[PDB]
Design an enzyme around this catalytic site. Structure first.
Site, PDB file in Angstrom:
ATOM      1  N   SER A  10       0.613   6.006  -0.450  1.00  0.00           N
ATOM      2  CA  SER A  10      -0.248   7.136  -0.335  1.00  0.00           C
ATOM      3  C   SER A  10      -1.486   7.032  -1.609  1.00  0.00           C
ATOM      4  CB  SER A  10       0.413   8.422  -0.737  1.00  0.00           C
ATOM      5  OG  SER A  10       1.284   8.596   0.517  1.00  0.00           O
ATOM      6  N   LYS A  35       0.887  -0.942   0.056  1.00  0.00           N
ATOM      7  CA  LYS A  35       0.052   0.017   0.142  1.00  0.00           C
ATOM      8  C   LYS A  35       0.786   1.203   0.017  1.00  0.00           C
ATOM      9  CE  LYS A  35      -4.331  -1.758   1.980  1.00  0.00           C
ATOM     10  NZ  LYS A  35      -5.313  -1.174   2.892  1.00  0.00           N
ATOM     11  N   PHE A  46       2.283  -2.419 -15.070  1.00  0.00           N
ATOM     12  CA  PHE A  46       3.593  -2.396 -15.142  1.00  0.00           C
ATOM     13  C   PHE A  46       4.366  -3.717 -15.343  1.00  0.00           C
ATOM     14  CE2 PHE A  46       2.670   1.501 -12.523  1.00  0.00           C
ATOM     15  CZ  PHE A  46       3.200   2.366 -13.375  1.00  0.00           C
ATOM     16  N   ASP A  81      10.433  12.202  -5.161  1.00  0.00           N
ATOM     17  CA  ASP A  81      10.328  11.632  -4.204  1.00  0.00           C
ATOM     18  C   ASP A  81      11.492  10.573  -4.448  1.00  0.00           C
ATOM     19  OD1 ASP A  81       9.484  10.803  -1.744  1.00  0.00           O
ATOM     20  OD2 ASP A  81       7.770   9.788  -2.508  1.00  0.00           O
TER      21      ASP A  81
HETATM   22  C1  2C3 Z   1      10.489 -10.484  -4.882  1.00  0.00           C
HETATM   23  O1  2C3 Z   1       9.485 -10.041  -4.084  1.00  0.00           O
HETATM   24  C2  2C3 Z   1       9.121  -8.991  -4.597  1.00  0.00           C
HETATM   25  N1  2C3 Z   1       8.416  -7.999  -3.564  1.00  0.00           N
HETATM   26  C3  2C3 Z   1       7.882  -6.563  -4.360  1.00  0.00           C
HETATM   27  C4  2C3 Z   1       7.965  -6.677  -5.379  1.00  0.00           C
HETATM   28  C5  2C3 Z   1       7.303  -5.068  -5.942  1.00  0.00           C
HETATM   29  C6  2C3 Z   1       7.091  -4.827  -7.185  1.00  0.00           C
HETATM   30  C7  2C3 Z   1       6.571  -3.660  -7.370  1.00  0.00           C
HETATM   31  O2  2C3 Z   1       6.193  -2.871  -6.213  1.00  0.00           O
HETATM   32  N2  2C3 Z   1       6.564  -3.160  -8.536  1.00  0.00           N
HETATM   33  C8  2C3 Z   1       6.185  -1.803  -8.821  1.00  0.00           C
HETATM   34  C9  2C3 Z   1       5.723  -0.789  -8.015  1.00  0.00           C
HETATM   35  C10 2C3 Z   1       5.589   0.506  -8.223  1.00  0.00           C
HETATM   36  C11 2C3 Z   1       5.240   1.660  -7.709  1.00  0.00           C
HETATM   37  O3  2C3 Z   1       5.067   2.808  -8.046  1.00  0.00           O
HETATM   38  N3  2C3 Z   1       5.421   1.404  -6.374  1.00  0.00           N
HETATM   39  C12 2C3 Z   1       5.251   2.566  -5.158  1.00  0.00           C
HETATM   40  C13 2C3 Z   1       5.991   2.598  -4.149  1.00  0.00           C
HETATM   41  C14 2C3 Z   1       6.004   4.088  -3.797  1.00  0.00           C
HETATM   42  N4  2C3 Z   1       6.703   4.213  -2.485  1.00  0.00           N
HETATM   43  C15 2C3 Z   1       3.914   2.162  -4.798  1.00  0.00           C
HETATM   44  C16 2C3 Z   1       3.620   1.278  -3.774  1.00  0.00           C
HETATM   45  C17 2C3 Z   1       2.459   0.723  -3.136  1.00  0.00           C
HETATM   46  C18 2C3 Z   1       1.291   1.446  -3.654  1.00  0.00           C
HETATM   47  C19 2C3 Z   1       1.382   2.394  -4.344  1.00  0.00           C
HETATM   48 CL1  2C3 Z   1       0.204   3.419  -4.672  1.00  0.00          CL
HETATM   49  C20 2C3 Z   1       2.718   2.843  -5.112  1.00  0.00           C
HETATM   50  C21 2C3 Z   1       5.616   0.711  -9.741  1.00  0.00           C
HETATM   51  C22 2C3 Z   1       5.960  -0.247 -10.546  1.00  0.00           C
HETATM   52  C23 2C3 Z   1       6.329  -1.312 -10.265  1.00  0.00           C
HETATM   53 CL2  2C3 Z   1       6.930  -2.722 -11.331  1.00  0.00          CL
HETATM   54  C24 2C3 Z   1       7.593  -5.547  -8.100  1.00  0.00           C
HETATM   55  O4  2C3 Z   1       7.560  -5.409  -9.155  1.00  0.00           O
HETATM   56  N5  2C3 Z   1       8.265  -6.942  -7.700  1.00  0.00           N
HETATM   57  C25 2C3 Z   1       8.363  -7.424  -6.375  1.00  0.00           C
HETATM   58  N6  2C3 Z   1       8.937  -8.609  -6.112  1.00  0.00           N
END
Ligand code: 2C3
Length: 346
Positions: free
Chosen positions: A35, A33, A104, A153
Site C-alpha cells: 500500500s 510492493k 532497514f 496490522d
Molecule cells: C530470502 O528471500 C527474501 N525474500 C524477501 C525478503 C524481504 C525482506 C523485506 O521485505 N524486509 C523488510 C520489509 C519491511 C516492510 O515494511 N515490509 C512491508 C510488508 C507490509 N505488508 C512492505 C512490503 C512492500 C512494500 C511496502 Cl510499502 C511495505 C520492513 C523491513 C524489512 Cl527488513 C527481507 O528483509 N528479506 C527477504 N529475503
C-alpha cells in the site's frame, strides 16, 4: 508525466536495477510492493552490508503517515531492553527524489512464504510454539507503558524470519501503527485478522494485536486462515460460527452492531434475519476450534497423526491459549505477560 519522470502513475518510484543513490546505496532489485510503496534490496557501500530500503510513495498522505512509522521505529529501536530485538531495526532514513526512504537491516522471507513452501500443510506445533512465544514477547515489549504501541496490522506477511534456516523472527511495517490514546479510525487491520471491536466500530487498544496473533497462530499450524471473510459481514459471520454471538454488553455499546446483528425484545442479540431458504453459515458456535485443530484426530486434517510433538495434551493447551486470545471482550482477552505464563509454553 510524474515527478519529472522518476515516478509511475501510482506515486511509486520507478525502480531501476543497478541505479546508485547519493554515492552510497546500490539498488539490486525490487523485493515487493505494498500500500505505502516499495521495498528494494540494496548494498550499502559505506557500512559494507546488504540492507532493505522501503521507498515510500510520493504523495502527501502516505509520506505523513510514514513519518509516524519512523518516529515509532526510533522510539522502539532506542529502548534499553533485550525484547526490542523482536522489532526490525531502522538504521536510518533520508529523502531522495521526493521519496522518503527507510533503511532497514536485511531479514529473510515472511511467514506466509514459509506456509506456502509447505503447500499449506502448516508448520509443526513446535515451530508454531516458537513463533507464538516470540510474538507474545514482542507484544509485551509494545505494551511497555512508555511505548504503548498498537501495531494494527499483524498478519503473516508482516512477520519475517531473521534467517532462512532458523526460527528467530521479527515484526515489520509499523506503517499503520499508533500509540494508545489517538483518534479512533475504523477500518484498520487486514480483514482476516481484524478484531470484533474494530468490525463493530468501537474503541480499540493494544488487545487488537493479541486477537490477530491468535488468528495467525492457528493459520500457521493449519495452513489456512481461521476467519476467511470476503467482506466485513462475512468476516463477522465466520467469527460467529466459531465463537458464538458476541455478548450483549459488547453489542449494546457497539455503533456497528446492527450491520451484523439484531436485538430481541428480551434484550438478547441474534444474527440479522436473512431471506427464508438462505443457509450459508454453520449455526452460532458450532464450528469448533477443537475440530479445526483436530485435537483428538491427529491434528489439522489428520495430517499430524502419530508424529511426535503433537499429543492430545499439546493440542489442548494450544487450543486453550488460542481461545484466551480470541476472547470477544478486550478487557479480559489474555495479555502478553499472562500469555507467556501459559502451560503451552512450559
Ligand atoms: C530470502 O528471500 C527474501 N525474500 C524477501 C525478503 C524481504 C525482506 C523485506 O521485505 N524486509 C523488510 C520489509 C519491511 C516492510 O515494511 N515490509 C512491508 C510488508 C507490509 N505488508 C512492505 C512490503 C512492500 C512494500 C511496502 Cl510499502 C511495505 C520492513 C523491513 C524489512 Cl527488513 C527481507 O528483509 N528479506 C527477504 N529475503
Amino acid at each position: 508525466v510524474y515527478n519529472d519522470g522518476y515516478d509511475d502513475d501510482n506515486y511509486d518510484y520507478i525502480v531501476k536495477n543497478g541505479e546508485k543513490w547519493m554515492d552510497r546505496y546500490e539498488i539490486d532489485s525490487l523485493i515487493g510492493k505494498g500500500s505505502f510503496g516499495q521495498v528494494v534490496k540494496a548494498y550499502d557501500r559505506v557500512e559494507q552490508e546488504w540492507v532493505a530500503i522501503k521507498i515510500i510513495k510520493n504523495k502527501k498522505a502516505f509520506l505523513n503517515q510514514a513519518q509516524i512509522e519512523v518516529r515509532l521505529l526510533e522510539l522502539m529501536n532506542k529502548h534499553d531492553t533485550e525484547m526490542k530485538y523482536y522489532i526490525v531495526h531502522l538504521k536510518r532514513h533520508f529523502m531522495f527524489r521526493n521519496h522518503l526512504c527507510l533503511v532497514f537491516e536485511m531479514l529473510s522471507y515472511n511467514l506466509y512464504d514459509l506456509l506456502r513452501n509447505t503447500n499449506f500443510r502448516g508448520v509443526s506445533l513446535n515451530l508454531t510454539r516458537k513463533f507464538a512465544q516470540q510474538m507474545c514477547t514482542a507484544l509485551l515489549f509494545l505494551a511497555t507503558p512508555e511505548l504503548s504501541i498498537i501495531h494494527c496490522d499483524l498478519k503473516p506477511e508482516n512477520i519475517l524470519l531473521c534467517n532462512p534456516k532458523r526460527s528467530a523472527i521479527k515484526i515489520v511495517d509499523f506503517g499503520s501503527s499508533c500509540q494508545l490514546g489517538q483518534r479512533i479510525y475504523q477500518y484498520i487491520q487486514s480483514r482476516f485478522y481484524r478484531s470484533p471491536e474494530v468490525l463493530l466500530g468501537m474503541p480499540y487498544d493494544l488487545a487488537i494485536d493479541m486477537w490477530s496473533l491468535g488468528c495467525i497462530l492457528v493459520e500457521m499450524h493449519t495452513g489456512e486462515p481461521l476467519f476467511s471473510g470476503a467482506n466485513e459481514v462475512d468476516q463477522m459471520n465466520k467469527i460467529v460460527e466459531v465463537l458464538g454471538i458476541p455478548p450483549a454488553h459488547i453489542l449494546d455499546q457497539a455503533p456497528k452492531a446492527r450491520k451484523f446483528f439484531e436485538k430481541l425484545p428480551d434484550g438478547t442479540w441474534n444474527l440479522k434475519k436473512t431471506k427464508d431458504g438462505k443457509r450459508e453459515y454453520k449455526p452460532p458456535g458450532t464450528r469448533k476450534l477443537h475440530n479445526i485443530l483436530g485435537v483428538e484426530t491427529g491434528g489439522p486434517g489428520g495430517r499430524r497423526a502419530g508424529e511426535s510433538g503433537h499429543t492430545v495434551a499439546d493440542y489442548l493447551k494450544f487450543k486453550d491459549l488460542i481461545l484466551r486470545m480470541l476472547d470477544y471482550d478486550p478487557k479480559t482477552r489474555i495479555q502478553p505477560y499472562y500469555a507467556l505464563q501459559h502451560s503451552f509454553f512450559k
